[PDB]
């Protein structure tokens, strides 16, 4: 579904004579808090040898976008498993918000790579601030000055049975 | 081919030669009656053959040709289902040969074949001329109705034979006026 950002902190349990461990913080994109916590443990075990019984979650939080009006540009690091071998991948995404970019990224990774939501491990999403750091050509296609183009798919849903008009993609 | 017998003893013409509309309006076939065979002496004019400029003797077949007379016409219009005659047009005076052809019991019939059709020239011809102008207007191809002078022939059958002939001259209107 439509995901959400989550500040998730874990601190694996202060034992006897070990007070206050190091409060490991991550940021998870998930549809709810529950799968966010599950993914947080799923990364924390890959960080080092914890279990969900070994530690605990400090604070689950949703964090919104500060400026969800501006179209930002993003460079994303992803790791995932082409089942036998892993490899990283760096993608550049023009999007208004972060979590919608991560949504579209999951859709694209499932489109081109047949990879599930569990197989995809987000490394980093960060805004590309200035122009020309867009290494990808296709996002750079929309960085031109005074960009104009016509609509493709003038075909629409006609919603009726018979048409008297002999219609036309008149665009 | 499966060898089943002929439908009519007058054999059908399934295909006619190509229409040239630059030639004058003229027939494309004829119906005669074969008399017999004989032998003809002629000279061969065939260079490339050893028999060039040499007397050859040749078997021929002669068909009696009575002059044929036209008594009607038939125009076919094109349909997407094929050729179809929209009408046929007859003349007024038809012989007892032809009126015999429509009848099976001519010897005892009251011979009532084309009586009310003769009333169609009792008028000016308005229905008939309407039909002629219709075949001018419609009916892309024209066939004429012809029969032979079988009484001028040693055939014992006094009943002449009717046939259609596709008319491969020019100008459908000039064809039907012809």
């Amino acid at each position: 579904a439509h995901f959400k950002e989550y500040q998730v902190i874990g601190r694996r349990l202060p034992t006897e004579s070990v007070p206050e461990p190091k409060l490991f913080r991550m940021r998870i994109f998930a549809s709810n808090e529950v799968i966010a916590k599950s993914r947080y443990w799923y990364f924390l075990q890959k960080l080092h040898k914890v279990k969900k019984a070994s530690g605990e979650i400090v604070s689950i939080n949703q964090i919104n976008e500060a400026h969800p009006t501006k179209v930002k540009n993003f460079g994303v690091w992803v790791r995932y498993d082409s089942r036998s071998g892993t490899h990283n991948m760096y993608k550049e995404i023009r999007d208004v918000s972060r979590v919608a970019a991560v949504e579209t990224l999951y859709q694209d990774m499932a489109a081109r790579h047949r990879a599930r939501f569990r197989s995809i491990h987000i490394l980093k999403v960060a805004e590309i601030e200035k122009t020309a750091d867009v290494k990808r050509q296709y996002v750079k296609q929309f960085l031109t000055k005074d960009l104009k183009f016509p609509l493709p798919h003038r075909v629409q849903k006609s919603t009726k049975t018979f048409s008297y008009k002999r219609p036309s993609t008149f665009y | 081919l499966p060898r089943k017998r002929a439908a009519s003893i007058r054999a059908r013409v399934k295909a006619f030669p190509k229409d040239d509309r630059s030639k004058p309006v003229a027939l494309t076939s004829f119906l005669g009656y074969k008399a017999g065979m004989t032998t003809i002496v002629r000279d061969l004019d065939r260079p490339g053959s050893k028999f060039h400029k040499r007397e050859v003797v040749e078997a021929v077949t002669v068909v009696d040709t009575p002059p044929v007379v036209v008594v009607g016409v038939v125009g076919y219009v094109e349909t997407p289902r094929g050729l179809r005659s929209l009408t046929t047009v007859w003349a007024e005076h038809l012989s007892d040969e032809v009126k015999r052809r429509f009848y099976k019991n001519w010897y005892k019939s009251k011979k009532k074949a084309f009586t009310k059709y003769s009333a169609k020239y009792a008028q000016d011809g308005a229905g008939i001329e309407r039909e002629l102008a219709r075949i001018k207007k419609y009916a892309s191809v024209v066939r004429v109705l012809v029969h032979t002078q079988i009484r001028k022939t040693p055939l014992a059958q006094k009943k002449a034979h009717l046939a259609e002939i596709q008319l491969n001259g020019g100008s459908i209107s000039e064809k039907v006026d012809w």
Partner: protein, 128 residues
């Protein structure tokens, strides 16, 4: 003559919470998505897929990535509300809204006035 997706292209969201509200493309996202704002019509600034919206032949000049207070300024200075209302298509939309707004005694008066107008036209007809 083509419409183009561009900044300052005033648009009309035929399907959604707007279901017809005049907005304007502030910025493009890709071939599929854009950024719009309709603060005069009341629809807020948002990202949208282009299927949910239609382009209008009207346009004006709008700055790249312009904020909402700047957007409403350039909207009013464009005065494309009046240019929209002057268009026969928006007149037809308001007309098909008004036809749904009709009452049965109103519709009966429509019947009577159509009779009377038809009488006058058929007198005006068959003399010219």
């Amino acid at each position: 003559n083509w419409r183009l997706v561009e900044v300052g292209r005033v648009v009309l969201i035929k399907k959604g919470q707007s279901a017809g509200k005049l907005a304007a493309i502030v910025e493009i996202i890709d071939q599929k998505k854009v950024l719009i704002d309709g603060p005069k019509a009341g629809v807020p600034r948002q990202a949208i897929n282009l299927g949910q919206v239609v382009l209008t032949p009207l346009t004006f000049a709008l700055p790249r990535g312009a904020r909402t207070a700047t957007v409403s300024k350039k909207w009013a200075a464009a005065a494309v509300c009046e240019k929209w209302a002057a268009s026969s298509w928006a007149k037809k939309i308001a007309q098909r809204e008004r036809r749904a707004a009709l009452t049965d005694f109103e519709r009966f008066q429509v019947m009577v006035l159509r009779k009377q107008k038809r009488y006058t036209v058929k007198k005006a007809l068959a003399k010219a």
